[PDB]
Amino acid sequence: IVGGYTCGANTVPYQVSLNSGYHFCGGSLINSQWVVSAAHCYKSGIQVRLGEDNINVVEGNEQFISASKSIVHPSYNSNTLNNDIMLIKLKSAASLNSRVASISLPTSCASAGTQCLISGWGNTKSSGTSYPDVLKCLKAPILSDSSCKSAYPGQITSNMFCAGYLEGGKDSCQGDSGGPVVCSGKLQGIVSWGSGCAQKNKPGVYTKVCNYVSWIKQTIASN
Ligand SMILES: [Ca+2]
Ligand SMILES: [Mg+2]
């Protein structure tokens, strides 16, 4: 996250860190046994780390649980990143408490102008590399689809939306991939892609979760 702030320990209780010997993507806890992340974050051998703040220090509120199965969306296209969403089932049910909570799925989509909270342990520099150890947060509004499509001609589908600032300065970035975009208490997006980080007229692109609630509910109930 570039131009964001330190969230504070466990203030984003549904945020997860996917680890394969190191943190490589974020995710969101939707219930005690399931996590949703981005399909481009797919890897074999994932350990889900819940209740994290500093990912390099065991502070006492973590739960490290291995994944039993991963399900990438049936129509995921790695070339365009269309349908960039995946579900991860935990080998054991997580113990929910104040520090580990699940986030609700939306009942409807959100409007341009709605402010959301984006979080993650990704890069914090637009031109450079600096990976933080504690969780960073950023409040950003959903942008109109016209501004999104003019920034990326021929690349945005109905399953994506842009959020951020066209002036640049504030944005999610690599390392944040797969993490949550929560608006009005519902998970509306997943950090998916963009062009560099925090560049002028290159807002971040997010998977539009409201389009996948039926597939999510149907899939977790059958697995
Ligand atoms: Ca920790
Ligand atoms: Mg994240």
Swiss-Prot record:
Note on how the cofactor is bound: Binds 1 Ca(2+) ion per subunit.
Keyword line: Calcium, Digestion, Disulfide bond, Hydrolase, Metal-binding, Protease, Secreted, Serine protease, Signal, Zymogen
Modification after translation, per record: Subsequent cleavage after Lys-125 leads to alpha-trypsin. Further cleavage after Lys-170 yields pseudotrypsin. A cleavage may also occur after Arg-99.
Catalytic residue list: 40, 84, 177
The keyword Chloroplast appears for this protein: no
Domain Peptidase S1: residue ranges: 1-221
GO MF entries: endopeptidase activity; metal ion binding; serine-type endopeptidase activity; serpin family protein binding
Requisite cofactors: Ca(2+)
Keyword Protease found: yes
Subcellular location field: Secreted, Extracellular space
Disulfide bonds: 7-137, 25-41, 109-210, 116-183, 148-162, 173-197
GO BP annotation list: digestion; proteolysis
Protein's recorded name: Serine protease 1
Organism: Bos taurus (Bovine)
